[PDB]
């Protein structure tokens, strides 16, 4: 029973090197193909009652993964790679634009989308739950989009903005979700309580980043003439900061591992010199790639589970499927809404954002596994004793987040190719 | 509860980079210090009833790891690194000596040690169980010894022999253990059945190695101008061969991942050229190092658990502790016995083995985690419905294998320094 999982990890990574050997340089990028293959395996095991004898058991184990673990195992090997592969040149001039786009943006979007669904969805949802789903659907991780913006070699400003916006969006999205979750549970909040919660959980978590950064930079300076330990040290530090933030200090872990990666991007030269700097990057690249292959295939599996696990109960009558496209058009309308509201500030701050770059920011709102963890968090709570939340409500969120994950990458991610190559 | 484990992984790897920054170039090598720190943490959590609030939960989760999983997660990242870092020059001339030392050797040792304990141990053990423990205690993995034999730069022949002997010893030790386990369960064997079991489980598993090797060498040849996928491919192939051997074809996995690593050591040049060959090694080095830091600390934790989990029941009256040194002196006497019996063959075959190298082969019988998995296998069966095996019998094996693991590394591994530096 335990080994079936090691089988699935191996099979999923082999599917990764197939879909990268093929589908490279073609018009169909990596991530969309990964997610489709994941949905394929998930459908083959769950839907087909014949089942698969060995792989199927491991697929089922990985599909029942706990969401907190789903974040803890993977994100510290994704956010760190992103925050480390960026450069100081652009970050110090784009920081104004991304922080202005990833805290106010998510507040606006959450407000809008939450209101929208509660008004036009007959499932008898309430304001807190609807704003809860808004906070869920407010994260962004356009991996395919940054991949293209480096493949076709566009301006680096757009790429830096669109990465950091995704990072600080994942962070503040988890923060707003946690707030609305405490709200749904029954905890009452006043203005001071909320302005203390957000302030601490954002800015206090940010400090842990550089605390660990300076400590581990000194300890990288003490070590002489070595590369293997220095790299394993950085890896262990990234993996320990996430736990020190999410479970020890009751603060956000994404901003912690994000402030730790850019601090390393700032002080890489003092700690690593010669070939040691070059190897540091290659190793981290693999950890990224592996972590990228497994996250997308697993994601697909999960979402397939979420459609078929209770297929008799829901995801059969077509009315739910129409509401799913309604929520989709609601998602981009709010993205458009956020960028229209924030256009003047984004204009004067940093380097000027022209209309076309604003057009790419309207696109590239691809959803990521970070919100899959949150949807699965709500469903796990709903199955257990819950107040206001009921199992069918968790049932709903799992398909709605999963559907927007599939729809955004297949449509927004694939057609991003057309806008940059021909229209621009 | 799940995150406590990610905390322990991070903490254990940080302890690794501490014990390697210190204790490097000193007379106290890496592995012994790792194992002592592991025993320290295990003792602090289990013995001290005060407990540790967070780390302790993760320590307990990792200490309750299933043995089959304990092998499957780690060994494919250890045996492959070993079988890949070796060179063709020596392997083709030492192969005769190691195969002659790791199949007949283990048969001799198992026979001797099994008989010895059954004769001089009053616990009312039977011949099958005693030979079972003999097969347990017949594995070797002297990591510290190969580390020294490369640090002080001795002849490569000794190093190659002493690595491959450890590899094929792990393999054939697991094979003999499985045979004696089927025996203990109740399955009856005749001469033909045994000569079929061993033949298939050894030589048929050996074929899977090169099947996967040639397949993955062709698929490394199709891919052009790339490094990240080629390396992730090799990793995934190593991790899938273990499962294809141990659970799909009912054969040994150690010889499979071992024939896959040397085939790559043979055909590295055709598949990887330029910097891609150099990076391939560095990445694998880390996977080795990490896997080496976690295996030893976890091992220590486990053995500490095995002494204190039932401290009231056993490991308190001194009589058991005396039998533990008796078994220790029995262990080296059989090592001496095996090499004395195999001396003439080892003489003429390959390059001549002189008396001093035979003296180092008498030493360097350090026990490894490979036999920890087997001891934990017997205990898990003993707790459940069992025939002939009873819980106290599994209770015994766990301390006896664990004690010989601690005693061999602290005594045989540390004093190996003295023999090579001054006596030779
Ligand atoms: C370099 C990597 C560093 C960190 C790696 C992980 C650190 C320790 C991992 C131990 C976690 C497993 C503990 C456990 O109980 O597993 C069960 C898990 C969750 O499923 P359950 O719902 O059954 O949870 C039971 C608890 N209520 O069932 C599962 O399906 C578990 C699957 C996930 C386990 C971890 C997989 C490792 C993947 C390696 C690649 C990571 C990216 C670099
Ligand atoms: C690059 C790595 C490739 C392969 C990595 C692993 C592949 C998939 C891992 C999933 C396995 C976890 C599944 C599970 O149920 O975990 C529980 C595990 C065993 O403990 P239990 O006795 O509770 O087992 C329950 C079943 N009866 O409880 C535990 O304590 C689990 C601890 C071990 C989990 C794996 C840790 C990963 C370590 C990464 C480093 C590996 C070396 C490179």
Description:
- Two copies of one chain form a homodimer.
- Chain A is mainly α.
- Chain A has a single domain (65-291, 317-392), classed as Na+/H+ antiporter like fold (Up-down Bundle), CATH 1.20.1530.20.
- In chain A, 78% of the residues lie in helices and 0% in strands.
- The first copy, chain A, has 19 helices and no strands.
- Chain A has helices spanning 3-21, 30-46, 55-63, 67-74, 79-85, 88-102, 104-120, 127-136, 143-151, 156-185, 191-222, 228-248, 254-266, 268-271, 275-308, 318-348, 355-362, 369-383, 391-423.
- The radius of gyration of chain A is 21 Å and the shape is globular.
- The structure holds the ligand CCCCCCCCCCCCCC(=O)OC[C@H](COP(=O)(O)OCCN)OC(=O)CCCCCCCCCCCCC (2 copies).
- One copy of the ligand CCCCCCCCCCCCCC(=O)OC[C@H](COP(=O)(O)OCCN)OC(=O)CCCCCCCCCCCCC sits between chains B (61-62, 64-66, 69, 73-74, 77, 239, 287, 290-291) and A (1-2, 5-6, 9).
- Chains A, B: It comes from Oryza sativa subsp. japonica (Rice).
């Amino acid at each position: 029973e335990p080994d079936d999982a090691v089988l699935f990890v191996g099979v999923s990574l082999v599917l990764g090197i197939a879909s990268r050997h093929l589908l490279r340089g073609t018009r169909v990028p990596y991530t969309v193909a990964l997610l489709v293959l994941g949905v394929a395996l998930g459908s083959l095991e769950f839907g087909t009652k014949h089942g698969m004898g060995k792989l199927g058991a491991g697929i089922r184990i990985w599909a029942n993964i706990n969401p907190d673990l789903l974040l803890a195992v993977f994100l510290p090997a994704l956010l760190f790679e992103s925050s480390f592969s960026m450069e100081i040149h652009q970050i110090k001039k784009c920081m104004a634009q991304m922080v202005l786009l990833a805290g106010p943006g998510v507040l606006i979007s959450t407000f809008f989308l939450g209101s929208a669904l509660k008004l036009t969805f007959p499932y008898n949802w309430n304001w807190k739950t609807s704003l809860l789903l808004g906070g869920l659907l407010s994260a962004t991780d356009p991996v395919a989009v940054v991949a293209l913006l480096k493949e076709l070699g566009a301006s680096k400003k757009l790429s830096t903005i669109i990465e950091g916006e995704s990072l600080m969006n994942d962070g503040t999205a988890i923060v707003v979700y946690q707030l609305f979750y405490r709200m749904v549970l029954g905890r009452t909040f006043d203005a001071g309580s909320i302005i203390k919660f957000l302030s601490e959980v954002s800015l206090g978590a940010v400090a842990l980043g550089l605390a660990f950064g300076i400590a581990s930079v000194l300890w990288l300076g003490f070590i002489f003439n070595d590369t293997i330990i220095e790299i394993a040290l950085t890896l262990a530090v990234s993996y320990i900061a996430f736990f020190t933030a999410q479970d020890a200090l009751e603060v956000s872990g994404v901003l912690t591992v994000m402030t730790l990666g850019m601090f390393y991007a700032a002080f890489a030269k003092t700690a690593f010199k010669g070939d040691s700097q070059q190897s540091l990057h290659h190793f981290w690249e693999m950890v990224a790639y592996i972590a990228n292959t497994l996250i997308f295939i697993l994601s697909g599996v999960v979402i397939a589970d979420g459609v078929l696990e209770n297929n008799v109960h829901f995801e059969r009558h077509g009315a739910s499927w129409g509401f799913l496209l309604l929520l989709y058009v609601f998602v981009q309308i709010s993205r458009i809404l956020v960028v229209v509201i924030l256009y003047p500030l984004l204009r004067h701050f940093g380097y000027g954002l022209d209309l076309k770059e604003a057009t790419i920011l309207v696109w590239a709102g691809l959803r990521g596994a970070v919100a899959l963890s949150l949807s699965l968090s709500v469903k796990r709570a709903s199955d257990a004793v819950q107040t206001h939340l009921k199992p069918v409500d968790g049932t709903m969120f799992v398909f709605f987040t999963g559907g927007i994950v599939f729809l955004t990458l297949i449509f927004n991610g694939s057609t991003t190719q057309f806008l940059l190559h021909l229209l621009g």
